[PDB]
């Protein structure tokens, strides 16, 4: 019953209950006036049962959801607001995130959507202990001590909203603002001041010093040709498309001087000295592969974009390492590591109108390796992918996903932020299905019986290819 889905030990009534919510540019002033459910779209969730305003107990986590949704990789970041209910609020903590189980065990209409019931008067009076409205609580992500909060859209109208920080107001270049805010979660840490870096670097593009690759192994040569090989005319004249490109490249660790699990470009000057050298080789590398791609590119956009990547992987090495050891048998390929977190993840049960969730651990041996995305099975009306609930957690950072249907009945998912893994940086790909109908499936409407994780980009017989590791599941019982 209620005790099989609700956790009492983390359920409670508190006055002036509060959380933090990330805000996209152009709305940081607007939502302080009240929160209202947007016009039709992402909805808070793909799954009907999970429509709602989402927040967290951690203002660094919400921050990461503030970048422009039209420019997820390079775009601007709005801000973080603090939202507070008046009076008493019931936090109702859940042991599972399957909306059909809940509805059964809580004695709810298996007819109506969960988050729809949650906002009703009669639901509040029956679960609220006088607390005026209920909010559901859930673990935020694996590798994270955080808590995700789910507010009913209608009930959320009573929130009072305060500015916690406006990232745009602070007037910096790139996402310097955002990553500086996140680096506060560190009372060793690696906090770099990044305008002292960016200026101190184009002052070092002279024409015609004090660095040493003692200790390291990784070298520059490959990167530059690699780089100069991906950027066509339309890419180089776009910072977003540029970043996507460099995001899926191998060997970025050699600019960044990252190996053996440590940040060896420690200081403002060691790093500044390093990026500079990168910039010119790339400039010197385009007159071998790309047409009229301007050498200004290697001075401007390239630099703006690489800085960003230094900021993603820095933010990662500042977070605790997710527990490395796979607890199931790893598949290795092109230097990675992929493993079902538990044997049970690798089974896709059927006989369900309900939803399921699946965890795959991803590791890497030494140097930062990108994850281009993931490939997913799809049966149009028996096995759909939950856009909203699928994500990748990287040392606790929940990276939300953009999902478009390529097909043959197969679905693709890009992270909305750069993902890298490596020694000390581990990820959890979490996958969620949603079945419109409980019709039946045997593997005679599946084309592939695996989940494909896509790694870095590669050149083989002169053709563009992503390094692919598959993981095999089983649709039985």
Q: Is residue 437 a contact partner of residue 353, using CB atoms and an 8 Å limit?
A: yes
The rounded distance, in Å, linking the Cα atoms of 218 and 215 is: 10
CA distance 247 to 227: 10
CA-closest candidate to residue 430, choices 454, 468, 401: 401
Annotate 225-290 with DSSP letters as a single string: HHHHHH--HHHHT-HHHHHHHHHT-S-GGGTTTEETTEE---SHHHHHHHHHHHHHHHHTTGGGTS
Q: CA–CA separation, 418 vs 67, rounded Å? A: 13
In angstroms, what CA-CA distances link 255 with 65, 258, 277?
Answer: 28, 8, 9
Q: Structure resolution in Å?
A: 2.8
b vs e for 200-218, b when ≥16 Cβ sit within 10 Å of the residue's Cβ?
A: bbeebeeeeeeeeeeebeb
Residue 161's region, left for phi above 0, alpha for psi from -120 to 50, else beta, is beta
Give me the phi and psi of 347, to 5 degrees please. -120, 130
Contacts of 441 (CB under 8 A, 6+ apart): 350, 379, 382, 383, 475
Burial class (CB in 10 A: 0-12, 13-18, 19+), 264: middle
Instruction: Tell me the pairing of strands 147-151 and 134-139.
Output: antiparallel
Q: Are 255 and 222 in contact, with CB atoms under 8 Å apart?
A: no
Location of structure tokens 């709005």:
78
Fold of 1-188: Diphtheria Toxin; domain 1 (3.90.175)
3-state DSSP assignment of residue 394: strand
Domain range 322-477, CATH class:
mainly beta
CB-facing half-sphere around the CA of 108: CA atoms within 13 A: 26
Helix (H) or strand (E) holding 241: helix 239-247
445 vs 29: CA distance, rounded Å = 49
The one-character DSSP state at 395 is T
Block residue for tokens 């359920």: 11
Q: In which region does residue 363 sit, left (phi positive, over 0), alpha (psi from -120 to 50) or beta (all else)? A: beta
Q: How was this structure determined?
A: X-ray
Catalytic site residue 148? Answer: yes
Q: In angstroms, what CA-CA distances link 187 with 182, 190, 318, 366? A: 12, 11, 11, 26
Instruction: Kindly name the residue from 70, 112, 122, 148 that is annotated as catalytic.
Output: 148
Domain locations in the chain? 1-188, 189-321, 322-477
Question: Which residue carries 């679905």 as its tokens?
Answer: 411
Taking Cα atoms as reference points, which of 207, 206, 183 lies closest to residue 194? 183
| Nearest-10 crossing angle of helices 195-202, 301-317 | 140
Q: Tokens at residue 303, please?
A: 């630099």
Q: State how far the alpha carbon of 270 is from the alpha carbons of 176, 211, 283, 456, in Å.
A: 19, 7, 21, 27
């Amino acid at each position: 019953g209620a005790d099989d889905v609700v956790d009492s030990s983390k359920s409670f009534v508190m006055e002036n209950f509060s959380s933090y919510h990330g805000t996209k540019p152009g709305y940081v002033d607007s939502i302080q006036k009240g929160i209202q459910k947007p016009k039709s779209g992402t909805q808070g969730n793909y799954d009907d049962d999970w429509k709602g305003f989402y927040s967290t107990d951690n203002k660094y986590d919400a921050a990461g959801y503030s970048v422009d949704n039209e420019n997820p990789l390079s775009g601007k970041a709005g801000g973080v607001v603090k939202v507070t209910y008046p009076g008493l609020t019931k936090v109702l903590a859940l042991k599972v995130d399957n909306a059909e189980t809940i509805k059964k065990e809580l004695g709810l209409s298996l007819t109506e959507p969960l988050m729809e019931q949650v906002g009703t008067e009669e639901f509040i009076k029956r679960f609220g202990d006088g607390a005026s409205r209920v909010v559901l609580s859930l673990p935020f992500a694996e590798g994270s001590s955080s808590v995700e909060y789910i507010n009913n859209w209608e009930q959320a109208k009573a929130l009072s909203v305060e500015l916690e920080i406006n990232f745009e107001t602070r007037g910096k270049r790139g996402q310097d603002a955002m990553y500086e805010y996140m680096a506060q979660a560190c009372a060793s840490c690696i906090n770099l001041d990044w305008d002292v870096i960016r200026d101190k670097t184009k002052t070092k593009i002279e024409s015609l010093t004090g660095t040493n690759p003692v200790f390291a192994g990784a070298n520059y040569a490959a990167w530059a040709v690699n780089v100069a090989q991906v950027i066509d005319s339309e890419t180089a004249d776009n910072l977003e498309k540029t970043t996507a490109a460099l995001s899926i490249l191998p060997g970025i660790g050699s600019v960044m001087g990252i190996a053996d699990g440590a940040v060896h470009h420690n200081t403002e000057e060691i790093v500044a000295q390093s990026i500079a050298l990168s910039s010119l080789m790339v400039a010197q590398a385009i007159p071998l592969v790309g047409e009229l791609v301007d050498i200004g590119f290697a001075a401007y956009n390239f630099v703006e974009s690489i800085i960003n990547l230094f900021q993603v992987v820095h933010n990662s090495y500042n977070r605790p390492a997710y527990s490395p050891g796979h607890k199931t048998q790893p598949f290795l390929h092109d230097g990675y590591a992929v493993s079902w977190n538990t044997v049970e993840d690798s089974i896709i049960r059927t006989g369900f109108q309900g939803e399921s969730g699946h965890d795959i651990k991803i590791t890497a041996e030494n140097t930062p390796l990108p994850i281009a995305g993931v490939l997913l099975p799809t049966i149009p009306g028996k096995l759909d992918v939950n856009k909203s609930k699928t994500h990748i957690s990287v040392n606790g950072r929940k990276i939300r996903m953009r999902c478009r249907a390529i097909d043959g009945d197969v679905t693709f998912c890009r992270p909305k932020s750069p993902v890298y893994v490596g020694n000390g940086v581990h990820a959890n790909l979490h996958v969620a299905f949603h079945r419109s109908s409980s019709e039946k499936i045997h593997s005679n409407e599946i084309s592939s019986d695996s989940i494909g994780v896509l790694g870095y980009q590669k050149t083989v017989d002169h053709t563009k290819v992503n390094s692919k590791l598959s993981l095999f599941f089983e649709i039985k019982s």
